[PDB]
Structure 1
Amino acid sequence: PQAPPVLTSKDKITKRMIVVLAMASLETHKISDKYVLLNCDDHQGLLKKMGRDISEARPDITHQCLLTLLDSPINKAGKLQVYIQTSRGILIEVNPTVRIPRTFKRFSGLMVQLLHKLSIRSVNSEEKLLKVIKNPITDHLPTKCRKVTLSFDAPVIRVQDYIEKLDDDESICVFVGAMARGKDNFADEYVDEKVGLSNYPLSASVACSKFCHGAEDAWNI
């Protein structure tokens, strides 16, 4: 057989979806040579002097969401792309062709290389996976898309029924922000609906994995 095709903004009218992450601590803080990330428990002077908070700043939320999302069965069936709106407004589009390491050191090194580069490359030297569309996600996304915020405060329903009710030409999108203290309003203006899946508060990795499990049993993905 063969794997499914590239699931990105190029795959627009076909069967595809978008997983959207936002309100994470993802920037380039160079320690005074190279480029480093904003860590709470590691740097004490730097984090306190930056102006952020230990409870507020969270750089591993994106790494955890990528670890819980890139290995999804629907992602190996070719149905999801990744859209990331960073704290500095950076919008990143990721195809499911590769899988970032769950090691936050290695994932943070790759993220710092992307932050100092905005350019990733393949081993085969034929498919630069890290694309950057015109920001935000909805400026170059598929022509038929469904936008909804999966909130713990919105109407909690089963993920199988709502996804099965969706058409195969639309692109269901979910916005997740894993703030230790926050609210489901990071991409509220982008979402066209407000739905719930869990009855307890969960991070972006847990909500994303629940959505992936619902999508896997939706159209047998």
Structure 2
Amino acid sequence: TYNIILAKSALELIPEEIKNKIRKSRVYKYDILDSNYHYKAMEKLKDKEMRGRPDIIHISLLNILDSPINHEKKLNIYIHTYDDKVLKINPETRLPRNYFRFLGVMEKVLKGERNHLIKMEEKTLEDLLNEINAKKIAIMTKTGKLTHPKLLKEYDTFIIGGFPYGKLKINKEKVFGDIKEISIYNKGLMAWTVCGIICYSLSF
């Protein structure tokens, strides 16, 4: 069984610092940060350029959940968020194709309401890796060593940044397993594309 993790994911309830600049509207009623609707209120938010993009997770998760490797129940799926929450996603989760429906599901989970298919915990990325006993970990980044996807099968755990801009920063000294930075392509790709490539590498 492989672990796939979308890490430092741009999926958060509205940060306390900017709550006062954001009101629920009929156009967007959710308490999830989304720069399409909240760009200006994010002006002075730390790391603003890597936050407020729930859509990246939505699309990545639509790829992951429908992959053959997932239909074969050979994945454990994790969303690690910017503010250190981890959502474990049941392989049989039927995720809404509608973006707003997706937001309403995620929003409840993030507020701690029980969802039997999506479990949430406060948890760092490093603690996550150690609890799942990750041993051979590939961090997908473009500055990584170019690797034909055929080799991805040698790892047990994959990490993909669930964000638009920046680099995934991980304290390797706090992680028991071995981490290798891997690039499967010479150009920058979106998270959902990397997720797809990994998932299909594992089937074919």
Distance (Å, rounded) in 1 between the aligned partners of 2:82 and 2:152: 30
The amino acid across from 1:56 in the alignment is: M
Aligned residue for 1:129? Answer: 117
Whether 2:111 is the aligned partner of 1:116: answer: yes
The amino acid across from 1:137 in the alignment is: L
Whether 2:188 is the aligned partner of 1:201: answer: yes
Is 2:30–2:104's contact at 8 Å kept on the other side of the alignment?
no
Q: Structure 1 unaligned runs (5+)?
A: 1-15, 121-127
Q: Which segment drifts farther, 68-77 or 19-28?
A: 19-28
Whether 2:202 is the aligned partner of 1:215: answer: yes
By percentage of residues, which structure has more helix?
2
TM-score by length of 1: 0.73
Is 2:4–2:159's contact at 8 Å kept on the other side of the alignment?
yes
Deviation beyond 6 Å, 4+ runs, structure 1: none
CA RMSD of aligned residues (A): 2.6
The amino acid across from 2:7 in the alignment is: A
- Which of 46, 59, 66 is matched with 1:64 structurally? 59
Q: Percent of counterpart pairs with the same letter? A: 26
By percentage of residues, which structure has more strand?
2
Q: Structure 2 unaligned runs (5+)?
A: none
Whether 2:166 is the aligned partner of 1:186: answer: no
Is 2:152–2:198's contact at 8 Å kept on the other side of the alignment?
no
Q: Deviations over 1:19-67 (max 9, x none)?
A: 111122222227558851111122355333x625764322222112111
Distance (Å, rounded) in 2 between the aligned partners of 1:182 and 1:144: 24
Whether 2:71 is the aligned partner of 1:76: answer: yes
Distance (Å, rounded) in 2 between the aligned partners of 1:44 and 1:210: 31
Aligned residue for 1:22? Answer: 7
Deviation at 1:188, TM superposition (A): 6.3
1:2-21 maps to which residues of 2 (within 5 A)?
Answer: 16-21=1-6
The amino acid across from 1:72 in the alignment is: S
Does the residue aligned with 1:117 lie in a helix, a strand or coil? coil
Does the residue aligned with 1:81 lie in a helix, a strand or coil? strand
CA 1:158 to 1:108, structure 2 compared with 1: closer, same or farther past 3 Å? same
Is 1:150–1:175's contact at 8 Å kept on the other side of the alignment?
yes
Distance (Å, rounded) in 2 between the aligned partners of 1:138 and 1:43: 32
Aligned residue for 1:51? Answer: 45
Does the residue aligned with 2:56 lie in a helix, a strand or coil? helix
Q: Which segment drifts farther, 34-43 or 72-81?
A: 34-43
CA 1:19 to 1:103, structure 2 compared with 1: closer, same or farther past 3 Å? same
Distance (Å, rounded) in 2 between the aligned partners of 1:44 and 1:192: 34
The amino acid across from 1:25 in the alignment is: A
Does the residue aligned with 2:146 lie in a helix, a strand or coil? coil
